[PDB]
Every structure is written in structure tokens, then in C-alpha cells.
Write a protein that binds this ligand. Structure first.
Ligand code: CL
Length: 684
């Protein structure tokens, strides 16, 4: 009868190899005292009574165990193998080796050591919710232990992190009970793969400190902050509050601790940061005249609902005439609602679809929420200022990348490299283009209008009138910013809470404004004390730290792995599986899947079950319900051809075969049943 030998679990690193989570082995000492423990020729293999006293001398000197306790245990009646309590467990490797040498030199047999593995998180309170926990779980079949990811990244990448288990034959007493430390390995375990995350430990450490200060200032019930590379979608730092120490779990049992992951599980109405998307759509639609004016004095009525600006609802002013650019700076709900009505519900609702709201990112984590998008006319209008629509933080980050990256939306990423150290192979990530909601010009103009949110002394909601300067500053750079306030729903009444500061406050910042390098998004729910100036506590120093790092944030193990052989990967049989979870799995393995349609079953895939898929290779997964033309921006020609063949559409190409789609002559969302021809422009 065999016993499983758990493989070493893979190490989780930051982007440059700083250890975030790793296995740690310690040992438990046992002594076999049964007079039945002899070889076939009756060689005594147990610890003999003539030696009990010497064992106590050794245990006292080496472990600080009182001689009388060692002696007591060694003399236990009816016992086969005995242990030695707390001092007999958690023994380091160096001490174990010393103890072994001591018994061997003293001619004492029967002492043994059983390995016990724990997961170590060296950075303590550091992206704790993101990393999650792997815990020791007992296999009820054979009594073996192995580490199993329970939450966060540990749980999400458990398949990669977990090696292939080994096998051993343990000796047993006559009662069938396993004798520990006696193993003979028969099948060697194969180590798990290492995961290099996109995180920058230095930046993350700095973010944790500033986030603690931000919580002291606001006393909010929860908060989040994430920094993203504006050009690649890589998550460089991410945290939430309240949090806990990953190594000791301290904070998890604190009053008010919230177990919900704020990056991808929590669903919320985002509020005014959504005006960034709105404004970009208005500019892209051609329905934005920055200079045209309007009045917020009477608000605006949609259906049977009244919409008003913040200053009107707080009695700051009787109303005022503003430019649309000024209303954007001022975060005027009325001005934005007017822009929404000018483009119309159908158009705006389609922009939200192009921005992928209501669709999970499937970026690699398990338990991601999808958000909620309403098709009710009142909600569509409200969504223009981020109410009546539910999102996750990661959906907002994804949308922000199109603003920061010339209209080209990117998939947020948290895995930089997956490494097989046994084989010396790796799979290294590159950016994943997933759509193009607006033009380069619309994105650029949106970013420029966002500077005024910070710089306009009269209208900017993020200008510090007391200091005569913007709240958010990063060296001498122009900073693209947008603040937000959002009404929060009440569980009792269903409707929004009315208390002072009983809101979700947030900000998005991009620096430098004209050619962004970094995006930062911060949220705080129900701050006891609030002032927009508090954002300077967390945004300013973190973005300045990011800018000061340079090649430390650009580089990773990627620079040094270009000559390293690439690990092979294949999907296996996925026809009939669920598209969502399959796409999520593929991204964990650095594949860039494109899910076609909304069905819950995979009908076709552009690569075969045993076909090798290179890192970053783009593939198509056609679901069983696919009726509308996708946004094909960034698709490879191979994928355009596969799609066209699957749906019987005639494609005319403009551009070299090596390129990816830069333009399509038929708009995304048109019925496939009426689409016979498309002109696709390729850009290499
Ligand atoms: Cl997807």
C-alpha cells in the first residue's frame, strides 16, 4: 500500500524574482521503541533502553527538551513510535542534520524525521488578498499532507503551482498504522512550476505604506488601489483594505475585515470615473462641441427620474451656465447626461458593449464577477455618470487601458512568466489587444480634457483651491485625472444611502498625460472623513515612485529568457466545455483566447486538441450562440480567415499578410446573417 508524497509547490515571485510565496520544510522527530521493530535476522532497529539516557542528553543539548520528558515518552506503554511534543516539531533542516549525525555517531538507531511543509509569505502585509493562501490539507485516504491553494492567486493557479505527486512505501505497525519517518520513495515527485507575477515588490511595498496612511485619513469601510502599465496592461501593484499579514494571518479575525476581493469579485456602481468612457464616446461619435454651453439650474429629467449636479444637491449654487469641457471638469451629471442623449441610448449602450462592461475579463483568476448592465432607458442615461450599472475594478482597469493606449484596449495581466525549473523552459507574457472602442484622436482628446479636472481653478474638482495647484501632482508632468463619487445602495431599503460621505469615492490618474506610462485607480467606500485632497496621499507619491524606477518596472525575467526554450502547451479536448472557465485557464497558460458569442458551450476552436500553442498565441473559441460581428481589432489574419470560413463571409484584405486587423468595413455588432462581405485592413 502506497502513500502520496506531495511535490514541492511552485514559488510565486514578483516580476524580477523577489520571493512572494514559497515552500518551507521543517521536521518532526520520532522514536520507534517497539521490540517488534527488527530486521529479518532480528537486528534491533528500535531505540534500545540501554540508549534512552543518551537520547535524552542529545535532545536536551540540541532541542532544550527536559531529560525526564524524553525518558517518559520513550518508556510509553504499548507504544510503537512516539513523538516529543512542540519542541519535537518545526525543527529546521540544519538542526535535523546535526541530530542525525549525532545519533549515527552514538550508534543509536530508531530515531526518524518526517517532513512537514508550510507556505511562507516573506513580505508579510503585501498584496495579501491578491496572493491568497495555500494551506496544508490532509488526504483522508493515506494521511498524507499537501499544500492546496484556498484563495486568490494560490487557488487560481493551483494547477500550475502544484507539482506531480510522488509515491512512497511507509512501514506500518501490525495495526496498519503508518510509522512516520521510515519512508522509501518509489516514485519521485515533480516540482510545481514557478509563477513570476507582474508585480513590482518595491512599488507594492511603497503602495502598502501609502494606503495605510490613506485609511488613517479617511477611515473608510474598504478601499482599493491598483497601478497598471498603460502600454502593456501589466498590474504593477495592487492592494485593498482592510487587509491581513499573509505569513501570520493577523488581521483576518479583526472586526470589519471583508473577505471580498476588490480587484475582481466586488461589484459596484463606479460613479463619475465612468464619464471618461462617456466623454471618449461623445468625441468618437462626433457629438461633442467643447464650447457649447448648457445650464444645470433645473437639472434634467429622464423618464420619471430627476438628475442634478452635486453642487445643486448640496446647495452650493443656484445653478450656472457652463461649457461641456467645464462641466466635465466640474463632474456635472447634467452635462454628461446631455451628451448621452445627444448620441442616443442605442449608441451609448453599444459603446458600453465595446468597452465590454457586463462581460468578465477572464484574466486568470477564479471567482471573477461579471458586473450588471441594464437595458432600461433610465439606467442607460444614469450609466453616463456611472450609476445604474455595476462593474468590477478589473473591468474599469480594462476600459481605462483604451484611454491610455491610443484607443486600443488591453487585457489586464498579472502573470509575467510561468517557469519549469526542472526542464529549464519558460512561457513569457506579452500584451494582449482585445478591442478598440474609440479612435486614437478621441482617446488623446479625452486625456487632454482630463488635465483640466486637475488644473482648472474654477471648475476642476481635483484642483486644490487652498494651495493654488492640482491635488494630483507627479513631478512637473501634466496628469490626466478624473474623480468620482458614487451613490451606494442600501440593503434594507434597496435604494441609495443618504448619509454624509456615505458614498464610493474614486480617482483614475494617468501620467504623463500625452503619452501615458502608468495608470492608477483608487477607491474608498464610506469614508468617515472626506476631502478630495486625500487622494494626494496615495496617488502622488506612488506614481512618482513608479516614474523614478524606470528600467526596474519595464524589465522582468523576460529580459534574460528570450534565449530560453519555450515550454510546450496544448488545450486538450475542450469542445463541449464552458467557454468562460476555459478562456480563464488558457490565459493562466499565457494563451490569448478570443471568445466568439455568448453561448455556454464551446462549439469550435481555431486550434486542435493536441496542437502546440505558443506563449501569447491568439486563438478563437466559437461558442454555440454567435450571431453578431465582433470588434476584430488586433486579430491575426489567420484568425480572420478561420472566422470567415466558419461563418461563410467573403473577406477582402488591404495590407500585408503578416499584420493584424486595424480596420473593418462593417461595424462590430451587425448581424452575421446579413454580413456577406467585409473589407479588413491589416497593419504589420
Ligand atoms: Cl475572454
Amino acid at each position: 500500500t502506497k502513500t502520496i508524497v506531495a511535490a514541492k509547490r511552485g514559488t510565486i515571485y514578483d516580476r524580477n524574482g523577489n520571493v512572494l510565496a514559497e515552500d518551507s520544510t521543517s521536521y518532526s522527530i520520532y522514536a520507534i521503541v517497539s521490540t517488534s521493530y527488527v530486521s529479518p535476522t532480528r537486528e534491533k532497529l528500535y531505540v534500545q533502553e540501554s540508549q534512552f539516557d543518551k537520547v535524552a542528553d542529545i535532545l536536551k543539548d540540541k532541542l532544550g527538551i527536559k531529560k525526564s520528558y524524553t525518558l517518559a515518552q520513550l518508556r510509553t506503554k504499548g507504544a510503537y513510535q512516539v513523538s516529543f511534543g512542540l519542541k519535537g516539531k518545526g525543527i529546521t533542516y540544519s538542526v535535523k542534520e546535526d541530530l542525525e549525525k549525532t545519533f549515527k555517531d552514538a550508534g543509536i538507531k530508531g530515531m526518524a524525521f518526517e517532513a512537514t511543509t508550510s507556505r511562507m509569505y516573506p513580505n508579510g502585509t503585501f498584496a495579501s488578498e491578491f496572493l491568497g493562501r495555500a494551506e496544508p490539507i490532509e488526504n483522508k485516504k493515506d494521511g498524507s499532507y499537501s499544500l492546496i491553494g484556498q484563495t486568490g492567486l494560490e487557488r487560481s493557479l493551483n494547477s500550475l503551482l502544484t507539482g506531480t505527486d510522488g509515491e512512497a512505501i511507509y512501514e506500518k505497525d501490525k495495526d496498519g498504522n503508518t510509522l512516520l519517518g521510515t519512508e522509501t520513495i518509489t516514485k519521485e515527485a515533480i516540482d510545481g512550476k514557478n509563477i513570476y507575477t507582474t508585480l513590482s515588490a518595491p512599488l507594492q511595498t511603497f503602495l502598502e505604506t501609502q494606503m495605510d496612511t490613506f485609511m488613517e485619513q479617511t477611515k473608510g469601510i474598504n478601499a482599493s488601489a491598483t497601478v497598471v502599465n498603460a502600454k502593456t496592461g501589466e498590474i504593477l501593484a495592487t492592494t485593498q483594505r482592510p487587509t491581513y499579514n499573509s505569513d501570520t494571518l493577523e488581521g483576518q479575525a479583526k472586526k470589519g475585515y471583508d473577505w471580498v476581493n476588490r480587484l475582481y469579485e466586488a461589484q459596484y456602481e463606479p460613479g463619475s470615473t465612468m464619464k471618461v468612457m462617456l466623454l471618449s464616446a461623445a468625441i468618437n461619435n462626433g457629438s461633442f462641441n467643447p464650447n457649447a454651453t448648457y445650464s444645470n439650474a433645473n437639472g434634467i429629467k429622464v423618464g420619471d427620474v430627476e438628475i442634478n449636479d452635486w453642487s445643486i444637491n448640496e446647495g452650493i449654487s443656484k445653478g450656472r451656465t457652463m461649457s461641456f469641457a467645464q462641466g466635465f471638469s466640474y463632474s456635472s451629471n447634467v452635462g454628461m447626461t446631455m451628451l448621452e442623449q445627444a448620441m442616443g441610448d442605442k449608441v451609448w449602450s453599444n459603446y458600453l458593449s465595446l468597452y465590454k462592461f457586463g462581460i468578465p475579463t477572464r484574466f486568470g483568476m477564479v471567482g471573477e464577477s461579471s458586473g450588471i448592465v441594464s437595458q432600461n432607458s433610465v439606467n442607460i442615461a444614469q450609466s453616463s455618470f456611472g450609476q445604474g450599472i455595476s462593474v468590477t475594478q478589473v473591468q474599469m482597469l480594462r476600459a481605462f487601458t483604451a484611454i491610455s493606449n491610443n484607443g486600443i484596449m488591453l487585457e489586464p495581466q498579472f502573470i509575467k512568466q510561468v517557469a519549469d525549473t526542472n526542464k529549464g523552459t519558460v512561457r513569457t507574457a506579452k500584451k494582449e489587444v482585445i478591442g478598440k472602442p474609440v479612435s486614437k484622436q478621441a482617446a488623446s482628446e479625452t486625456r487632454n480634457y482630463m488635465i483640466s479636472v486637475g488644473t482648472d481653478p474654477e471648475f476642476g474638482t481635483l484642483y486644490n483651491k487652498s494651495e493654488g495647484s492640482p491635488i494630483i501632482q507627479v513631478g512637473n508632468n501634466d496628469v490626466t485625472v478624473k474623480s468620482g463619487t458614487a451613490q451606494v445602495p442600501d440593503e434594507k431599503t434597496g435604494t441609495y444611502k443618504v448619509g454624509t460621505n456615505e458614498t464610493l469615492n474614486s480617482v483614475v490618474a494617468m501620467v504623463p498625460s500625452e503619452d501615458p506610462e502608468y495608470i492608477m485607480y483608487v477607491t474608498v467606500q464610506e469614508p468617515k472623513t472626506w476631502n478630495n485632497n486625500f487622494f494626494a496621499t496615495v496617488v502622488n507619491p506612488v506614481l512618482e515612485e513608479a516614474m523614478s524606477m524606470g528600467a526596474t518596472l519595464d524589465t522582468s525575467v523576460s529580459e534574460g529568457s528570450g534565449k530560453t526554450e519555450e515550454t510546450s502547451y496544448q488545450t486538450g479536448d475542450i469542445i463541449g466545455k464552458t467557454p468562460g472557465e476555459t478562456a480563464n485557464t488558457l490565459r493562466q497558460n499565457l494563451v490569448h483566447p478570443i471568445v466568439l458569442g455568448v453561448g455556454n458551450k464551446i462549439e469550435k476552436v481555431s486550434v486542435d486538441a493536441k496542437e502546440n500553442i505558443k506563449a501569447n498565441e491568439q486563438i478563437l473559441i466559437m461558442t454555440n450562440e454567435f450571431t453578431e460581428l465582433p470588434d476584430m481589432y488586433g486579430w491575426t489574419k489567420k484568425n480572420v480567415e478561420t472566422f470567415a470560413k466558419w461563418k461563410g463571409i467573403k473577406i477582402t484584405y488591404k495590407g500585408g499578410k503578416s499584420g493584424t486587423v486595424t480596420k473593418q468595413s462593417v461595424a462590430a455588432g451587425e448581424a452575421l446573417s446579413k454580413t456577406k462581405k467585409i473589407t479588413i485592413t491589416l497593419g504589420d
